[PDB]
Symmetry: C2
Subunit: 440 residues, 2 copies
């Protein structure tokens, strides 16, 4: 028995490793926490393969897609444990009447400002152009945040009416997509204008923004509670407040519930549930993670009634209420990827705001059709890379269809040692398919 | 079924498999390796489905025409006889088992169809096909029939089709041209029209098969039949006093039967290849081995020089050799599989009346020239969205996993709605299909 944990690199993974080493002292079970990049994308590729984690930590929005593929184990908490966490966090990890993860903490973006460079932060977005010009004369800048991840750009886009999927009477409408309406265009136009008027740089990312704010070079940034730890060390005199309003409407950040899912085929399910229920989601467990990087508003009632007395957590909750909970439907991946493309292309000038958001809408409504419209041209006649050629040969053998002579000539000419190892990998792929189903 | 330390042999049911079983018993006594002879139906079709799976034979006995297709898929082991053994067999039978400069089987016997006639009912067999309609009416007046043979396999219908120029693939400069198919020329139309006229004019019945034809001749109900040397054994016991001669001519041109060289191939993935080579070279392809098979059912003109020089003094073997020269050796190229399947449909449909002779052979010709492109033009409509039989959708899901391609939402929920183990056993067959692919690849 052993536990392998995956968590994002901006969260307190060292603190989590301490509760894991607490677990090991008590149980003798090894616990390993890793922070791979794009782990939310890697998980469906490694689930049920033995190459993945027993426990995956990410915002709740990605877990519905995992569940629809049958990759997440359904959790079975006791009523007593169920009541230890806030009902709002349990709903974030519910998908088709089943719980598919343990909710950990509520995270929401907030405005972080340098009190020495700006004692009175702007209440509206429109104050920032005039405010940037004034600080630029003093060798500073008004605002810097990560423009290349749509999580950070969305609060302004949704402010005046942008939305992902329309939500009417308890269900999401996967075909009513609102990334291309008037309010979305209004917010994204304003953001591009800031870049054209040299108030922001379109290439700015997370590290540049956070380094700039912690170096006292920018007055404001937009970030979540995890950022507070490094501002503390940097001794920047900072505050956390509500995001500026746009066209009088408040900014509407997408609210994330950090959640821990278990691989449906993991041999260590009961060890995973025990670690999550009895070690991490306790006062001491979450305090260990919180000390490394702040979790935000935790789902555990006892600890959150103490956390709620910090004005930074109060600001997070207030920004969180102005926003909305992220959907957990599988189409969210298409939503994020399309919106990431649109905001970067508009900010860099490769498309207009109207061209960028329309394409973003077409991706979303067309993505449920899958990554493949039709086998690559000439594949069933033997044209293509050998790995894809062996895949289609395996397919035709599975279906008892006689392959073309072009395929058979490719089948005869491929190297013995290379074709064998490729086809052994195919067997490892089917081995995973078997485990996913047997875990149902 | 395939196991190490034993040999499993597949041979057609009309051949002398009991005689072959006796040489296998002799092999077992000498070596301790048990030999098991089986005669499943459609074994020439079943072998490619079971090759390299352990459910097939170590040795397959069939005419050479099917072995080139087996070789193109890498299912046949390459043969490595010494030059000394090579000269024990006639050089031309080795040509029947040569494919892409490699030998892929052992030649056993040369088989050719011949005209078998009841000497008591007809002392002077016809020289031309056109004599038989007039010959039938006279025997029908006595309650008999002139000719009945297996119409359901084109092997028997082909000698009359090829007489006036029907051919499989043209032969240019020692090579076979896959794109010049001669199933639709005037002579092909001419020969099959004659055969349909016989059925219209109630000289033959389109439903006649091997079992019906052979029963009547052995019961003295028909004067003539068309069959190969394997058939002589049942006519001997029946005490019908018969003869074996040349097939009648049609439009002055001789009948050109496709000649088959009965051959033994070895599975490219067999653990008993050395045992197979040793059994084939040292026990069966000997005077004693082939005589044991020939006593059960006649092999025809064997490829082994020493034994055939005794066989050739039999007039029936002379007639078999004679018809063999009037015909041509079959190509062993993979498209022969398409050719035979195609002219089987054409001859059955024209004989049963479902199409005209000219349309039947034209469509027969198109299938032959289209077979290189494979059995699939494109995936069934809606397959990538989850619509289709359960096995093919899970196959395409496996394919998208192999290639790291995101599946559609229709595919994902079909994946969610499938029976838990109905999918698990479908996927285990997938696990073993790849296991077979691996053995085929590693067998080179
Ligand atoms: O930007 C798209 C991205 O947004 C969210 O990711 C957040 C995450 O929730 C936070 O914990 C933190 O790691 O910042 C991320 C943005 O870089 C969604 O959770 C994610 O699915 C989506 O792709
Ligand atoms: O009829 C199609 C069939 O013809 C030949 O098969 C022969 C075989 O050669 C003989 O040994 C004997 O078994 O009669 C068979 C016909 O019933 C071809 O060799 C074969 O490929 C083809 O399918």
């Amino acid at each position: 028995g052993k536990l392998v944990i995956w968590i994002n690199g901006d969260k307190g993974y060292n603190g989590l490793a301490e509760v894991g080493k607490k677990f090991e002292k008590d149980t003798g079970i090894k616990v390993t926490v890793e922070h791979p990049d794009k782990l939310e994308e890697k998980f469906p590729q490694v689930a049920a393969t033995g190459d993945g984690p027993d426990i995956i930590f990410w915002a709740h929005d990605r877990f519905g897609g995992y569940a629809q593929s049958g990759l997440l184990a359904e959790i079975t908490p006791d009523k007593a444990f169920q009541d230890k966490l806030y009902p709002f966090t349990w709903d974030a990890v519910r998908y088709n009447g089943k719980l598919i993860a343990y909710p950990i903490a509520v995270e929401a973006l907030s405005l972080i400002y340098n009190k020495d460079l700006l004692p009175n932060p702007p209440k509206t977005w429109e104050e920032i152009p005039a405010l940037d010009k004034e600080l630029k004369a003093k060798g500073k800048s008004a605002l810097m945040f990560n423009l290349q991840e749509p999580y950070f750009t969305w609060p302004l886009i949704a402010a005046d009416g942008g939305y992902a999927f329309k939500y009417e009477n308890g269900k999401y409408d996967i075909k009513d997509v609102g990334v291309d309406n008037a309010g979305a265009k209004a917010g994204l136009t304003f953001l591009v204008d800031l870049i054209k008027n040299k108030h922001m740089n379109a290439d700015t990312d997370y590290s540049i923004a956070e380094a700039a704010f912690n170096k006292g070079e920018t007055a404001m940034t937009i970030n979540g509670p995890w950022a507070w730890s490094n501002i503390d060390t940097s001794k920047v005199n900072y505050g956390v407040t509500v995001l500026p309003t746009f066209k009088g409407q408040p900014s509407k950040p997408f609210v994330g519930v950090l959640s821990a899912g278990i691989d449906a085929a993991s041999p260590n399910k009961e060890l995973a549930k025990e670690f999550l229920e009895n070690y991490l989601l306790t006062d001491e467990g979450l305090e260990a993670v919180n000390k490394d990087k702040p979790l935000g508003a935790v789902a555990l009632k006892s600890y959150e009634e103490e956390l709620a007395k910090d004005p930074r957590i109060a600001a997070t909750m207030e920004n969180a209420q102005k926003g909305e909970i992220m959907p957990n439907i599988p189409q969210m991946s298409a939503f994020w990827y399309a919106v990431r493309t649109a905001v970067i292309n508009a900010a860099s000038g490769r498309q207009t705001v109207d061209e960028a958001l329309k394409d973003a809408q077409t991706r979303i409504t067309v993505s449920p059709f899958g990554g493949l419209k039709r086998l690559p041209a000439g594949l069933l006649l033997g044209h293509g890379p050998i790995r894809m050629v062996l895949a289609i040969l395996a397919f035709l053998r599975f279906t008892a269809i006689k392959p073309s002579l072009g395929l058979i000539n490719r089948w005869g000419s491929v190297g013995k040692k290379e074709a064998m190892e490729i086809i052994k990998k195919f067997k490892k792929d089917l081995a995973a398919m078997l485990r996913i189903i047997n875990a149902r």
